[PDB]
Amino acid sequence: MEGEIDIAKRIEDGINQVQCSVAEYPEAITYLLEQYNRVEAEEARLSDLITGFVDPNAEEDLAPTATHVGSELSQEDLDIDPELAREKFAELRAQYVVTRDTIKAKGRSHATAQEEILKLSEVFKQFRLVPKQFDYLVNSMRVMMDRVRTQERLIMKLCVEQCKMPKKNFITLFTGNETSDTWFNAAIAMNKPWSEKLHDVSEEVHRALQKLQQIEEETGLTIEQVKDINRRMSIGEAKARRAKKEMVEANLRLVISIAKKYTNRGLQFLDLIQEGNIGLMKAVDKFEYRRGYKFSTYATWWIRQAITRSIADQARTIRIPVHMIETINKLNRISRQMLQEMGREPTPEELAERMLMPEDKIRKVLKIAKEPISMETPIGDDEDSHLGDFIEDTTLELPLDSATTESLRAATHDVLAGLTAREAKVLRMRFGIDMNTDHTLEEVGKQFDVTRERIRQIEAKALRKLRHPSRSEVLRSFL
Amino acid sequence: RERMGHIELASPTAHIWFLKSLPSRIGLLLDMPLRDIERVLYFESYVVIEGGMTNLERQQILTEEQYLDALEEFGDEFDAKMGAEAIQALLKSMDLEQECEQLREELNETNSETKRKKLTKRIKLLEAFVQSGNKPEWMILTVLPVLPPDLRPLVPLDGGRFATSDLNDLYRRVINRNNRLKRLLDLAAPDIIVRNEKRMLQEAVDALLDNGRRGRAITGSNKRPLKSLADMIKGKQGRFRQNL
Amino acid sequence: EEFDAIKIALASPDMIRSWSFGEVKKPETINYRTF
Amino acid sequence: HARSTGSYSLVTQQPLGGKAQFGGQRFGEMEVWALEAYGAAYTLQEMLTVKSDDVNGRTKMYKNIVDGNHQMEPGMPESFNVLLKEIRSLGINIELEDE
Amino acid sequence: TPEEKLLRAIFGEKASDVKDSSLRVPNGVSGTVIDVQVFTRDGVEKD
């Protein structure tokens, strides 16, 4: 079987069109050197920035690193010698110096700044940037310019659709520099029957222009050339995407094949091949036809890896730890081990010296490993009787003690008055009539008498007096 | 035991108490008959018209074989759409005032058998939506309320164990039905498999509200007729007569 | 006291949004540890 | 066997029967129509609310025959006030109303 | 508990740590005993 290798050459072919495009990008370059500073002071590593290099200095020659540039999946589904490395990274700062200044203040033409970056662009292609980086550079490249598209789309429909402007009168002005108000002011000075209409939107265009320049300065490229970089990236990812749609469709038979190892466990079958299809679409992207290993073996590796992760935790109706289910079968492949030899049941004495568990707490562990049990299950009547219909309630008092609890929390404050005014008024007129008790330096001025000593004495002396209310009760209920 | 919740479903889903309850309420007012069109489009790929180019039909389907041939030439735009995605957009884009008079004049022009047979349930239903303060676009549930935890308790039985209702399982499933059709199929899959997925959503939603109507739901371990909502409510597992 | 007549009408997302306070996304129930 | 007071469920809220305590005779429907024939009234609504379903009307009644008084009229059944929510989760809204 | 000592302080303050939680006779009619068996962890093969 084959019919997947001949079309596999179309994959890496499209990636090459992305490698070059990303090269000419200041933001993608600044992050490179800026991250290098985290290596000198020892905070990160060159492992998550560079994996290798290349000998030729043209357009690739060996299986590239860019794998998540033409993937069909979403961004959420895309997740050497150190001495030689530091040597090449020192070559970038030997030229990035002049570039570090032409971005801060620049001038009127951005073509001069990018001209110097072009030389560095050739060097950036030599480095084997980690595929993880492409998930940030390319991603933050289509989003950064995403706002530019809309920001310039509003002003486009506020004069062409609103002020009624011909397409031949907007493509000859806004297409010019689309930076300053040199295209807008030139429209009104054109003494056209429609030029005297942009005055009713000049305020909206101005705000949509000033904020627009902010993004242009943030990137450091010309709004006209910045589109050229991305427009050619959609060509390489398209030729590879459609080329991989024939491998993730004719290989759906292998997904169900290995889907018989994780059936009834915790997840349904409909959601079983879910992690199986997403895995096949990942392997096809990181597949190399120039490798000894085939595809029917390399692809089934990531498939069984995505299905063993979902059912690894969210299997039961309730969350369950990882080792709690791996500790069961652990004591299983040893129980029969001593039964096939001796012939007797392994008593909890010999296994207590080989394991890290004593013998008492290990018994309570099994109590946790259950289903446990439903509620709507027939018992005896099999008509109206349910498992969850025989458990008595404790939060809701029954009519039997409903009259008792009521007479045990509303009758003490009646006989309380019949007691020494001093000691009784202290506790009663504190939290019973007001809020919060025990203030110390405040209670001493509440009765105007003793100090902070009787704050504890009066309360204690009163406690033993609460023994009086026998038939009446209030305090004996909170606990 | 009071108050409820909801779940923002990315993919619209018609209700079940208004679909199988003849006469239809989510299709009848939409020119759709009752079963010979509003049941087949839910299954495998069956592209149906919901809009219209220039004076077309609102019942005629469209074969996939004639789909790729009606893109370039020989055809126009053709507002193509899958299954459940084409049922809520119509309710909001229809006028009960004008549409009512369109079928009112169709009771003597044509024979009472080819069209009038169905049109008899058109003026009656619509008249109710006008007299009352309602609106056609309320039959589609974009969200789904949650049953109070008091009706689905979770209290330990005996031995350090616990006790939960199987109804809870019908909530942990629906979550995986929607989030999957967001960042995996609706921007990657060709088309010969993305349709099947959308078919599973509608079947997984109408199962919770009322199980036993269409495509009975089965839990993971230990089969047994899985319990839902409406089933436990009125008690349909006993054919009513032997009520509690 | 007592009950008289009963009113019935369709349910709208605008009304259901009132009783509800939020949306559930995590299928996870409760914990067996601290309950 | 004879029962007067016992435990009750939560969602169901009905008389049960444990070990130490006896069980209550379930008033079957077969004895309901035989009562309706006479054309009674209060003796029919009692065998549906306080004496089974109604909870807050069961406790209040217990505190009425103890002092030698009389129990007032029952309230709203629990198997009825929960149905309002049971039906509420079916895409349909239900609301009560007086006169 | 402190609040508990209040109740027993009225009916003779004598709260011991351990109590008598023996199996009481179920409702109905009692009767004499036949035999008594005690297996305080025998050296046999008990489960």
From Swiss-Prot, chain A:
Location of the region described as Interaction with anti-sigma factors in the Swiss-Prot/TrEMBL record: 452-467
GO annotations of cellular component type: cytosol; cytosolic DNA-directed RNA polymerase complex; sigma factor antagonist complex
This protein's UniProt keywords: Cytoplasm, DNA-binding, Sigma factor, Transcription, Transcription regulation
Residue range(s) of DNA binding per entry: 441-460
Disulphide linkage map: none
Region (Sigma-70 factor domain-3): 326-402
Short sequence motif Interaction with polymerase core subunit RpoC: positions: 271-274
Annotated spans, Sigma-70 factor domain-4: 415-468
Record note on what altering R464 to D/E does: 2-fold reduction in activation of class II Crp-dependent promoters
Its biological purpose: Sigma factors are initiation factors that promote the attachment of RNA polymerase to specific initiation sites and are then released. This sigma factor is the primary sigma factor during exponential growth. Preferentially transcribes genes associated with fast growth, such as ribosomal operons, other protein-synthesis related genes, rRNA- and tRNA-encoding genes and prfB.
Subunit description: Interacts transiently with the RNA polymerase catalytic core formed by RpoA, RpoB, RpoC and RpoZ (2 alpha, 1 beta, 1 beta' and 1 omega subunit) to form the RNA polymerase holoenzyme that can initiate transcription. Identified in a complex containing RpoD, the RNA polymerase subunits RpoA, RpoB and RpoZ, CRP and DNA. Interacts with Rsd; this prevents interaction with the RNA polymerase catalytic core and with promoter DNA, and as a consequence, promotes transcription from promoters that require alternative sigma factors. (Microbial infection) Interacts with Escherichia phage lambda antitermination protein Q.
Free-text comment about domains: Contains 4 domains, connected by flexible linkers. In the active conformation, the domains are in an extended conformation, each making extensive interactions with the RNA polymerase catalytic core.
Protein name: RNA polymerase sigma factor RpoD
Originating organism: Escherichia coli (strain K12)
Residues of the full protein shown: 105 to 611 of 613
UniProtKB/Swiss-Prot annotation, chain C:
Top-level taxon of origin: Bacteria
Post-translational modifications reported in the UniProt record: Acetylated on several lysine residues in the presence of glucose.
Use of this protein: Co-administration of salinamide and rifampicin or salinamide and myxopyronin suppresses the emergence of resistance to both antibiotics.
Subunit structure: The RNAP catalytic core consists of 2 alpha, 1 beta, 1 beta' and 1 omega subunit. When a sigma factor is associated with the core the holoenzyme is formed, which can initiate transcription. The rRNA transcription and antitermination complex (rrnTAC) consists of RNAP, NusA, NusB, NusE (rpsJ), NusG, SubB, ribosomal protein S4, DNA and precursor rRNA; S4 is more flexible than other subunits.
Role summary: DNA-dependent RNA polymerase (RNAP) catalyzes the transcription of DNA into RNA using the four ribonucleoside triphosphates as substrates.
UniProt similarity note: Belongs to the RNA polymerase beta' chain family.
Identification of the protein by name: DNA-directed RNA polymerase subunit beta'
Residue window of the full protein shown: 15 to 49 of 1407
From Swiss-Prot, chain E:
Protein's job: DNA-dependent RNA polymerase (RNAP) catalyzes the transcription of DNA into RNA using the four ribonucleoside triphosphates as substrates.
Segment of the intact protein contained: 896 to 942 of 1342
Recorded family membership: Belongs to the RNA polymerase beta chain family.
Gene: rpoB
Protein name, UniProt field: DNA-directed RNA polymerase subunit beta
Biotechnology: Co-administration of salinamide and rifampicin or salinamide and myxopyronin suppresses the emergence of resistance to both antibiotics.
Subunit structure: The RNAP catalytic core consists of 2 alpha, 1 beta, 1 beta' and 1 omega subunit. When a sigma factor is associated with the core the holoenzyme is formed, which can initiate transcription. The rRNA transcription and antitermination complex (rrnTAC) consists of RNAP, NusA, NusB, NusE (rpsJ), NusG, SubB, ribosomal protein S4, DNA and precursor rRNA; S4 is more flexible than other subunits. In pull-down experiments interacts with CedA. (Microbial infection) Interacts (via flap domain) with Escherichia phage lambda antitermination protein Q; this interaction renders bacterial RNAP resistant to transcription pausing and allows it to read through termination signals.
Post-translational modification: Acetylated on several lysine residues in the presence of glucose.
Taxonomy, superkingdom: Bacteria
